[PDB]
Amino acid sequence: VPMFDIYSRLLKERVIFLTGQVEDHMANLIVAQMLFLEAENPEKDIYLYINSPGGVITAGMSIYDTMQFIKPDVSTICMGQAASMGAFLLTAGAKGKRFCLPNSRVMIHQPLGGYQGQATDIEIHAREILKVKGRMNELMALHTGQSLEQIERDTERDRFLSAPEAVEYGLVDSILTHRN
Amino acid sequence: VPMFDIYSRLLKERVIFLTGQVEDHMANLIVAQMLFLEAENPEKDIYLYINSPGGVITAGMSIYDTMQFIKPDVSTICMGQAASMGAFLLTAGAKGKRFCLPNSRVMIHQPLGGYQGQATDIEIHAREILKVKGRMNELMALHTGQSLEQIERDTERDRFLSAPEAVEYGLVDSILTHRN
Amino acid sequence: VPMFDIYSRLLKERVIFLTGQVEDHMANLIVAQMLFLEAENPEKDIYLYINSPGGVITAGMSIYDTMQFIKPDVSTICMGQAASMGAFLLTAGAKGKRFCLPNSRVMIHQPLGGYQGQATDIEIHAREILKVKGRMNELMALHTGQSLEQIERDTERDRFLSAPEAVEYGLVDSILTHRN
Amino acid sequence: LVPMVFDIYSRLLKERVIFLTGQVEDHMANLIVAQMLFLEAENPEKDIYLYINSPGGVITAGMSIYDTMQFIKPDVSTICMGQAASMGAFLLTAGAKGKRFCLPNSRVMIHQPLGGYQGQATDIEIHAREILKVKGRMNELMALHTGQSLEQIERDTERDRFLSAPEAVEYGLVDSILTHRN
Amino acid sequence: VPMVFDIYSRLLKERVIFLTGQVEDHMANLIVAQMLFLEAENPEKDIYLYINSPGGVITAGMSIYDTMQFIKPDVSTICMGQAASMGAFLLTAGAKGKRFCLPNSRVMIHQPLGGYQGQATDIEIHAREILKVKGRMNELMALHTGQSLEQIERDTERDRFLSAPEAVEYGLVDSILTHRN
Amino acid sequence: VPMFDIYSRLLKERVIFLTGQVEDHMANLIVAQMLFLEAENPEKDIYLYINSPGGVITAGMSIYDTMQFIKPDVSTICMGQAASMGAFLLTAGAKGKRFCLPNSRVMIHQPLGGYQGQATDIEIHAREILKVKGRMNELMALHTGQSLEQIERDTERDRFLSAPEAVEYGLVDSILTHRN
Amino acid sequence: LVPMVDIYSRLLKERVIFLTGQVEDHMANLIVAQMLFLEAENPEKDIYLYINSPGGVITAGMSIYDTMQFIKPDVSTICMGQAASMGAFLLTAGAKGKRFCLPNSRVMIHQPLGGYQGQATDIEIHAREILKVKGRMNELMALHTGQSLEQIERDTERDRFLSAPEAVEYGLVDSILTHRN
Amino acid sequence: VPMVDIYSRLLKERVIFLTGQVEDHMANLIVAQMLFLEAENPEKDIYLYINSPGGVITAGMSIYDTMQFIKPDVSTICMGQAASMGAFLLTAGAKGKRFCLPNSRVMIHQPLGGYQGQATDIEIHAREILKVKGRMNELMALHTGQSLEQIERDTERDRFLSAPEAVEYGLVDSILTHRN
Amino acid sequence: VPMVFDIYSRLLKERVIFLTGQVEDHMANLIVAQMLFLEAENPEKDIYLYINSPGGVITAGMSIYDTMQFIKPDVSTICMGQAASMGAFLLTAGAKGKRFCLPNSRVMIHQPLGGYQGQATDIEIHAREILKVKGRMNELMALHTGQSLEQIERDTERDRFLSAPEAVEYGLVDSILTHRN
Amino acid sequence: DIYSRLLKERVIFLTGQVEDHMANLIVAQMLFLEAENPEKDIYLYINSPGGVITAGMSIYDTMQFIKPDVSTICMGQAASMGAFLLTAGAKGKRFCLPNSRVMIHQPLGGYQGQATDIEIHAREILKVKGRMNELMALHTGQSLEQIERDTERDRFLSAPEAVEYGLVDSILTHRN
Amino acid sequence: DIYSRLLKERVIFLTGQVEDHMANLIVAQMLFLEAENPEKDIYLYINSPGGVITAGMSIYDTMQFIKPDVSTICMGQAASMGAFLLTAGAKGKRFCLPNSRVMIHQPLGGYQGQATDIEIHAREILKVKGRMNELMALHTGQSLEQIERDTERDRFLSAPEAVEYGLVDSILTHRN
Numbered sequence A, B, C, F: 001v002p003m004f005d006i007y008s009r010l011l012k013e014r015v016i017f018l019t020g021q022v023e024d025h026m027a028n029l030i031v032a033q034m035l036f037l038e039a040e041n042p043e044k045d046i047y048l049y050i051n052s053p054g055g056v057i058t059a060g061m062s063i064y065d066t067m068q069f070i071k072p073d074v075s076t077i078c079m080g081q082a083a084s085m086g087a088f089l090l091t092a093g094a095k096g097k098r099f100c101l102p103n104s105r106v107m108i109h110q111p112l113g114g115y116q117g118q119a120t121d122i123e124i125h126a127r128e129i130l131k132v133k134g135r136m137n138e139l140m141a142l143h144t145g146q147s148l149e150q151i152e153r154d155t156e157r158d159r160f161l162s163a164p165e166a167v168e169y170g171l172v173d174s175i176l177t178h179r180n
Numbered sequence D: 001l002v003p004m005v006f007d008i009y010s011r012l013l014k015e016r017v018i019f020l021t022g023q024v025e026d027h028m029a030n031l032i033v034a035q036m037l038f039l040e041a042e043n044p045e046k047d048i049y050l051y052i053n054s055p056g057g058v059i060t061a062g063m064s065i066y067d068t069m070q071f072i073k074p075d076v077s078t079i080c081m082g083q084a085a086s087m088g089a090f091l092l093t094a095g096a097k098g099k100r101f102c103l104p105n106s107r108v109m110i111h112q113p114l115g116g117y118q119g120q121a122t123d124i125e126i127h128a129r130e131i132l133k134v135k136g137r138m139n140e141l142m143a144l145h146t147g148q149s150l151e152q153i154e155r156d157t158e159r160d161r162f163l164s165a166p167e168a169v170e171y172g173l174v175d176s177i178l179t180h181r182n
Numbered sequence E, I: 001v002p003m004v005f006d007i008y009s010r011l012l013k014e015r016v017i018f019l020t021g022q023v024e025d026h027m028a029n030l031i032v033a034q035m036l037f038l039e040a041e042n043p044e045k046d047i048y049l050y051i052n053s054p055g056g057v058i059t060a061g062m063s064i065y066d067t068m069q070f071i072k073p074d075v076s077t078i079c080m081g082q083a084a085s086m087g088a089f090l091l092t093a094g095a096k097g098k099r100f101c102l103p104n105s106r107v108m109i110h111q112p113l114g115g116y117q118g119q120a121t122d123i124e125i126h127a128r129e130i131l132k133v134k135g136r137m138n139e140l141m142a143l144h145t146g147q148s149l150e151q152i153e154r155d156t157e158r159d160r161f162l163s164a165p166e167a168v169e170y171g172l173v174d175s176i177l178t179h180r181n
Numbered sequence G: 001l002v003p004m005v006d007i008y009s010r011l012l013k014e015r016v017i018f019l020t021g022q023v024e025d026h027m028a029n030l031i032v033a034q035m036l037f038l039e040a041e042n043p044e045k046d047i048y049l050y051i052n053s054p055g056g057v058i059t060a061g062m063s064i065y066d067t068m069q070f071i072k073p074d075v076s077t078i079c080m081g082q083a084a085s086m087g088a089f090l091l092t093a094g095a096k097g098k099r100f101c102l103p104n105s106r107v108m109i110h111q112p113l114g115g116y117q118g119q120a121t122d123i124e125i126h127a128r129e130i131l132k133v134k135g136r137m138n139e140l141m142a143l144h145t146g147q148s149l150e151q152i153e154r155d156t157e158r159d160r161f162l163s164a165p166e167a168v169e170y171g172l173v174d175s176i177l178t179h180r181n
Numbered sequence H: 001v002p003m004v005d006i007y008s009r010l011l012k013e014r015v016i017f018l019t020g021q022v023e024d025h026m027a028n029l030i031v032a033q034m035l036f037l038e039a040e041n042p043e044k045d046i047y048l049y050i051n052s053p054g055g056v057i058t059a060g061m062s063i064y065d066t067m068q069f070i071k072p073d074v075s076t077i078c079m080g081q082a083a084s085m086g087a088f089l090l091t092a093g094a095k096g097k098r099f100c101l102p103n104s105r106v107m108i109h110q111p112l113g114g115y116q117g118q119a120t121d122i123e124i125h126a127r128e129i130l131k132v133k134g135r136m137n138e139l140m141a142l143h144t145g146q147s148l149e150q151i152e153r154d155t156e157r158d159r160f161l162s163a164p165e166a167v168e169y170g171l172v173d174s175i176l177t178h179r180n
Numbered sequence J, K: 001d002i003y004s005r006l007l008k009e010r011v012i013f014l015t016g017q018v019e020d021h022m023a024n025l026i027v028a029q030m031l032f033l034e035a036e037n038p039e040k041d042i043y044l045y046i047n048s049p050g051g052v053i054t055a056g057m058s059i060y061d062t063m064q065f066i067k068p069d070v071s072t073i074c075m076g077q078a079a080s081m082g083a084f085l086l087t088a089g090a091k092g093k094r095f096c097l098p099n100s101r102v103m104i105h106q107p108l109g110g111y112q113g114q115a116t117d118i119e120i121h122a123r124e125i126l127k128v129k130g131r132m133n134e135l136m137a138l139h140t141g142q143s144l145e146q147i148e149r150d151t152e153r154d155r156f157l158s159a160p161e162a163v164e165y166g167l168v169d170s171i172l173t174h175r176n
């Protein structure tokens, strides 16, 4: 990692990178960077680049709730891909400030999970992932402006969206083409 | 491998052994041995020893359905232990002809299972193991003579029964102790 | 394996066993027995017991065409479970001679596959698994009496059937309960 | 690598913020305990802020954080982020009353202690008694912090039980929901 | 194995041989030895070769091929589950008129696969070899199917599946085998 | 690691290195580098050395879209090799500022991929990788000046380019041999 | 995995011995044992040794070679699939006029491979020995093929493939075998 | 392989095979065979084919002492190779009846050993392998008619002998070439 | 590593770069980075590249080689220990007149090594490509040694060791450094 | 940086298995010391079982090339290449500590491949053995023949025996 | 840093198994300390089960050779070479803590190869065992005969037992 090191200087310009699989510890680092920037200045926008194939729902939810919680607007920019929990956090950005780069791609689907144990415990845990599915679809509908029923239909199986399609789906607000 | 071998010669006396973990192939051996003894003589009792920790539920139901289908009474004898599907196949024997040896032990509990994938598939497979729990419990009421909601409670967790409690429970009819 | 071995002894009664995963070498053994049984007496029914979770499609189809090609009717009996390709070969028995036991279950779904390579290669194998899915669904519709659409809608995701449901669906013609 | 501003987690310690993240075990808990003492040392009056995102973990390790939280002069305010299961739910409900929060989409799981032993029957009895004594006390400390009766906590912890943020408020595990900063 | 002689032994005295699974030296040698035995036992009756194979080692397949062409008996081939690559090749190499697909078998054909490791000089020796192997396999297939060598070349560059009807139309087999007479 | 290391020192002169496999994390660091240099001087050229055999397409597209978006020209110099995604990122520098060293080579082909699962899902991901192949060829045709179908035939299979043939093909503009 | 009537045993009654797979001491000893036994059964009748091998251990192979020359009966060798390296040597080692290739079989010849680990002094002892075995192989190869020593040397420095026809014109084998007459 | 049993039938002609690594169990097999052929006719010759890289010394000496002990002369035939303890049992056959096939080769050397532990125990074991080295060289001098000192000088390092050389050295009496 | 700045960073101030061990992409890049920094620091003062290497990835070496010829300053190559294959190639590629062995270093040359696995068609592609690489390697070799391309071809078919004097005599290096001059 | 401080006293440590990267870090320290001062001695401490010859030769040629006299001090052991580099110190400056031990033997090697390549690589290791022997004779003042006779097998020398043999010059026991 | 900081107070820690690289670290710290002040005592805390003999001997020859006395202090355990280096300290300046323990025994070893080589390496470990036993007798004041009767098998000495044996000079109980 080349020399403030490269990421930490970009953090001074309110830039945060979410990269790779979503799990607790990289999630916590994003949360901490957001909380830190809100302290440095609750008025200025935060920029979160998202290149991710997805990952742990509860961990992405910590970034989501931090995203809504803090004062600053969190702008999202998708480069490479934003899949599943990655696509969910991209559309979670402040309305009007969610972006895809021209050849970034997006994928949405339904929650994934797995359990082993007794029938009683399996029902508990299956009941809970369905509640998570419903919560995601609602939040998904809310950020995209699609109906709940459109989210449900379209996430039952993997659905890919090009950058233009994700603009037209309401997942992002526009494409970043070149700096003016 | 003591010797025409010791199990095949024991089979000549209508004696079938269900040892160890219950799965598709060992269960198939027993299905075939029962079919064969039935072909030899539909009148005579068949003796099914059971020293088993349990195992795959559908594998066991292939034995259960075969026991109930074939004309001969299938007598069951618990030596060692009959746990989970082992207990089930022991109480499935012809009423009056189900026996624990003096120190054999019995354990009953609910189906174990699990699966991983999309929420929608998790739901389908949770539903299914719940349906199985229901049937298994119904079928246990049938054979032991206890109320459905008694079985449901006695098997939510691991529940041991000594040979006496297993008779008093309805699982077996009597204890074997000394040949007459 | 008990002793003439037990499976050989029941071959004499024109009973074949399909147990466990469908793959080439076990499927081959099953085919070899059908050809033998037909060469012994092309007019008598053959009895195929099925307890399997499914397996390789081409291996399963090899059994299927043999069942149809040979002179005898092939009666299919499901014990334990007949899943995926096991459900297919179950329903492919002689019309009117297809049976579930009271407590066996059936499950149906669409083909599984997978491949790695260049986009062009992926396309060739993807086209092929869809054709196979097409063929399987057509045959399922033929053997159950259900519309092609019904089959396709019901096989996108794993669907379970109790023995009663398997009869009401056209997978089997009746339940075997006791030997009359 | 960690971004620097002081790495990121050190700067947020200045504002008296501490993250509990991932599996609870001895060294990550001892890290948290050490921060809680530092904070109490740097200012015995100001509040400490403990972010919890955890599936739980080793009970004795969690109980080291817990006793530190009660022992210290500072009120410790806990904030659930993605999830607080098992020892994490316990430590969440253990923060200063009125200062325990769920983020709107965090979730809480409660259940009973896991464990087990291997050895002679005589020793199996000792270790079974111990985990039963532990389960008894934990139930009591959950009843105390949540406000639920001891019997209720028992019924509800025999099996896994999920609570959303609002249900966690209604249950007494947390006090309110943090939705937008004021 | 199930007795009646195990069941393959029983179908061997009816001149049925089973090519099943991957093609390699030892299963291929086993098929060759069955043909020679069936040829000794009666060189005037046909041999029945059931093929359910995904392919395998080319030189092991060619010991089966040369043995079918060599022995006096005709070798009739029936493809039951799949016959892919070397599997398809041995299927199409049966006695003309006596090559069948069961109705739901499939066939796949393509070009040789291989691999070498070592010095440039030996890489070239081996690369040139497999190209020649390719040229002979394409020739034998054209011969047995009646396609032009050029057609065989086009259709084997990449994997190509043929259903049982399509195989009949391609020349790869002679008839489908539906219900026994 | 000869250290403020040597790459940080080369960064000062707007020299970025792309070495080895393309993947999310080395790709993210090149994007962070590119962004940092724009912020320094959004007018001064940036130089990307490419010595790579390829890697994950979406990770390369994260770098590709960053090159086009940022205000500065990105000059691409290939040393050693630019294979697959590496060729793509090479041909994607500024027209006129794309170089090969004398004995470096270039290799181009089509997307490689692999999915497994249900036939329906195989179709979705097969269809996505074909979309990816088409959009890759379009941008390949756009940056080299060849036609969509010339790129299409030349990329069905692995195709090697000497540094002269790279120039002739429009993959790069010229060859650096000695420093002026 | 075998059929009974056992199949290779039955083919042994026709004086047919099989050399499949990699040459190593134990598979080789099995072939010497069948050769010795077949001699004792009748020292005048030929022996048929079908060869489909990539090669293998030299000494293990030399144990089949010397058995072949030692025994009274002629050992006719037949290549099916491939006879590579030690496999090829044993092919061309058959009785003169009775070594055959099947039409699409193939043959590859090269030089001894080995390796050693140890002290310089011991490295020399073993390197010399593998060079001496290389010299004895090229000689016995020059003998059985009718080629000069120098030609065998040049042609085996690196891997060299021979089609069935090129093997006949090289002296490895006497003639191809297309159909049972 | 080939039960027709090929090794059993050659044993009836008094032929024993020593193949592969010399260890207690295969050597016990050779001993058991020699014992049996003595008990069958203590006067006819026995024929030990040797193709062997050597092996454990005490395992081998059990074969050696059995060869001298039994009334029958044990003719030895090297075939392929006889190295180390293979060479020793080769030359240990009956005088005038030790043969090499023309292209067999022999290798001789001193014993190999390995020990770990306390210095006091290392001495006890190093003393022992020197004793075993002295005895082996002695016996080897006695069967080759070479001096002890010549044997000692030649076995310090690996020495290869061809079939003729092994005759010249006295390890075998002559070369079998063609059956008379 | 010892600090002094660490020992290698300190020798970089004296314009000394170390090429140690297997040649692969990341160690090659650090070498290229170093040379870009040394030219920038002073486009005229010589660069000293110590080489002790058994070889490695050709494209990775070729990134070093082309960086060496592009940059303005002369690159002086000092062999110590061993320069084998691509390491030999990079040592003889230093500034003409300034390529050295130390007295007991040894050099080894041979032809490219590679390996492919796949369809026959792609095997053709990659075998052609490695023959293309072998030719240019031989050509750049002859250029830097002065030997005829034919001589290079004959002497790199197999591993060929050269002592320090032999490498001087061959054109690989220009002289030997024995004691300090 | 304890080795860095000790480096300031012109002390370089040869520890453990000899291979390319540690040899190269050995060479880099010797060049740095020469540049810091070409007239002062360097002290190379050796505690090694040996290792890769070409790696040791890169250390050996550097010791001869650089201007400073490289004194060698054996502690623990110097076996095989470790003892070659010990005997290659500046004459009169090669030291054993009282309870170090020295082991000389012959090159070890191994190849796999074609017989032609086996002969190529075996010829080479015999060439290496001769030059190892040549240089061993050179620094100990024994004859090539004596060295060839003494190194065919493992051979242990104690500090006194290492002085008699010529491998080292004397024994350090206590600091004067 | 905590260990660097205790090194400034002339304290080195010998902890765990004795092998080449941890032993080199110890030797480097001793030469560093001797240079920093060749007149001031060095303190060596030993908590170790033993380990490689030649590595241990490089420590041992450094302790003897350098100017400063090396006072050794046993903490936890000093077994085998651990015990050897503990009795290696300056007479009068070797300590045990009250509840530390000490184990002595003979050298352990292992070779594999030709008989002639086994003899060579077997001979050498016996020489090593002689010198080891000779040095121990020296440092403990016991007779040679006593040391080897006592070390032929594992022998445990408590702190008072090791004072009485001559392995260390006194016990440390509380700071004064």
Ligand SMILES: CC(C)(C(=O)NCCSc1ccccc1C(F)(F)F)P(=O)(c1ccc(C(F)(F)F)cn1)c1ccc(C(F)(F)F)cn1
Pocket (backbone or CB within 6 Å): F009, F010, F012, F013, F015, F047, F075, F077, F079, F097, F101, F176, I036, I037, I038, I039, I040, I041, I066, I067, I070, I071
């Ligand atoms: C990128 C380029 C600036 C470059 O790497 N300089 C490295 C020197 S950094 C530097 C500079 C000033 C002060 C201090 C420093 C340092 F180092 F102390 F920090 P360049 O010189 C180059 C290109 C290719 C190669 C090779 F060998 F890999 F092929 C090599 N060098 C270059 C030249 C020409 C062009 C044109 F004309 F084509 F546009 C573009 N780029």
